[PDB]
Each structure stands twice: as structure tokens, then as C-alpha cells.
């Protein structure tokens, strides 16, 4: 574990992370996709060998020795608010199991279901609170990656509210 497990947020491309493993905002089919998924495919294409996995699950594939945890959040265009909420919480619980099994001291994570899978809603608080529910019992340093300036501020405030 990290000596004093922490949460941090950075506004930059998760493909440039400084952590021991990365979480992909994957699609269920292991396709290159859009947004964060396409950035992950450009940096770690080898990790998309047999990465297909269902909604609400995570599947780890190595790129060399570097673990890529493909986490499949629900697309709120297709799911009801109720069933999507359940599957989004489930994907983060599976990320926490994978981070624990790998023995890493740090992980780079994007907010699942906040981009092309948001169904055109602002899901920062919903997605971040399910991230915390899963990751709070882990001892990895967690570094959340975002791209919007206002979201960086809101994520940073939310981390500070609990310290
Ligand atoms: Cl960047
Ligand atoms: Cl998304
Ligand atoms: Cl963002």
C-alpha cells in the first residue's frame, strides 16, 4: 500500500499518468472507442487483446508489465437512471477488487459514465461518490484525471470536504 493513502485530481490526459496502473473508461466490446478510451487505445493498444467484458465489470490486461483495468460503465442513453446507477456502482467495486489483486501502490482513474455515456446529464457527483464508495477501503494512492477546468475545481473541493 501507499504510506498515507490519498486522493488527488489532475486536469490532463490520463495517457500521461504517473501511477502504477490505469483504469480505462472502456466499452463492452474492447473497441478503440471515443474520448478517454481512444486515448488509452493510442497509448496501450496491446492491452485491448481480449479486453471485452460486460457492463458493470472490470477486466485487467497487461501492456508489458503495466496493468490496464478496462472498467465498463453503463451508457445512460440505454439504461434507466435506476439500473444505470446500480451498474455504475458495480463497475467501481470491480475496479477496487482489481487494484487490490494487482498489489499496486497507485492508480490513475477517470470518472466513469461522465462523457459520451452520460446520456447528456452532469454526473460528476454521482460518479465521484460511487468512486469513493469503492476505493475508500483500498490503500492505493488514487489520482483522478479530468479535462474540464470547472470539474477539476469541484472534484478538488469534494476531496477536501472529507480530509
Ligand atoms: Cl494533457
Ligand atoms: Cl463516458
Ligand atoms: Cl472532465
Curated annotation (Swiss-Prot):
Written domain comment of the UniProt record: In the N-terminus, the macro domain displays a mono-ADP-ribosylhydrolase activity. The central part called, the alphavirus unique domain (AUD) has a zinc-binding function. The C-terminus region, also called hypervariable domain (HVD), is mainly disordered and binds several host proteins. This intrinsically disordered domain contains 2 SH3 domain-binding sites and 2 FGDF motifs necessary and sufficient for the formation of nsP3/G3BP complexes.
Membrane topology: Peripheral membrane protein
Assembly description: Interacts with mRNA-capping enzyme nsP1. Interacts (via C-terminus) with host G3BP1; this interaction inhibits the formation of host stress granules on viral mRNAs and the nsp3-G3BP1 complexes bind viral RNAs and probably orchestrate the assembly of viral replication complexes. Interacts (via C-terminus) with host G3BP2; this interaction inhibits the formation of host stress granules on viral mRNAs and the nsp3-G3BP2 complexes bind viral RNAs and probably orchestrate the assembly of viral replication complexes. Interacts (via C-terminus) with host NAP1L1.
Domain of life, per lineage: Viruses
Locations listed in the record: Host cytoplasmic vesicle membrane
Post-translational note: Phosphorylated by host on serines and threonines.
Function as written in the Swiss-Prot or TrEMBL entry: Seems to be essential for minus-strand RNAs and subgenomic 26S mRNAs synthesis. Displays mono-ADP-ribosylhydrolase activity. ADP-ribosylation is a post-translational modification that controls various processes of the host cell and the virus probably needs to revert it for optimal viral replication. Binds proteins of G3BP family and sequesters them into the viral RNA replication complexes thereby inhibiting the formation of host stress granules on viral mRNAs.
All residue ranges annotated as the Macro domain in the record: 4-163
Protein name: Non-structural protein 3
Taxonomy of the source species: Viruses, Riboviria, Orthornavirae, Kitrinoviricota, Alsuviricetes
Binding residues for ADP-D-ribose: 13, 27, 35, 115-117
Amino acid at each position: 500500500g501507499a504510506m498515507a493513502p490519498s486522493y488527488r485530481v489532475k486536469r490532463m490526459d490520463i495517457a500521461k499518468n504517473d501511477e502504477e496502473c490505469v483504469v480505462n473508461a472502456a466499452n463492452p466490446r474492447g473497441l478503440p472507442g471515443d474520448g478517454v478510451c481512444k486515448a488509452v487505445y493510442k497509448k496501450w493498444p496491446e492491452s485491448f487483446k481480449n479486453s471485452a467484458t460486460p457492463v458493470g465489470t472490470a477486466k485487467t490486461v497487461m501492456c508489458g508489465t503495466y496493468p490496464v483495468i478496462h472498467a465498463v460503465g453503463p451508457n445512460f442513453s440505454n439504461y434507466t437512471e435506476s439500473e444505470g446507477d446500480r451498474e455504475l456502482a458495480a463497475a467501481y467495486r470491480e475496479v477496487a477488487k482489481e487494484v487490490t489483486r494487482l498489489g499496486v501502490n497507485s492508480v490513475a482513474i477517470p470518472l466513469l459514465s461522465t462523457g459520451v455515456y452520460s446520456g447528456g446529464k452532469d454526473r460528476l457527483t454521482q460518479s465521484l461518490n460511487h468512486l469513493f464508495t469503492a476505493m475508500d477501503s483500498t490503500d492505493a494512492d488514487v489520482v483522478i484525471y479530468c479535462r474540464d477546468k470547472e470539474w477539476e475545481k469541484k472534484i478538488s473541493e469534494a476531496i477536501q470536504m472529507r480530509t
